[PDB]
Amino acid sequence: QLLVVENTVEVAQFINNNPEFLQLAEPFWKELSHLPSLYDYSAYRRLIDQ
């Protein structure tokens, strides 16, 4: 029986800015725009799905 458990990391990290200074992707922002402004869970679930 062998186990090999093995990682190379070589972008030691990225740190994304906090939500204030992050720029949203255009299609994601478009989907946020089309969210119904009411608890229609179908729409928000389609968001969490994508």
Add this chain to the structure above:
Amino acid sequence: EAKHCVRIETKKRVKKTKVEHRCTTNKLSEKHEGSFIQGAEKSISL
């Protein structure tokens, strides 16, 4: 191993005689061989 051999002779006369042999032999050999090699390696490197 065993050999166990017995022999008897008889005669009687004023005439009857018997000469007789019965013997049985046993042999046994058991042979045993066994091997068990076990091992483990770990290598943790950072």
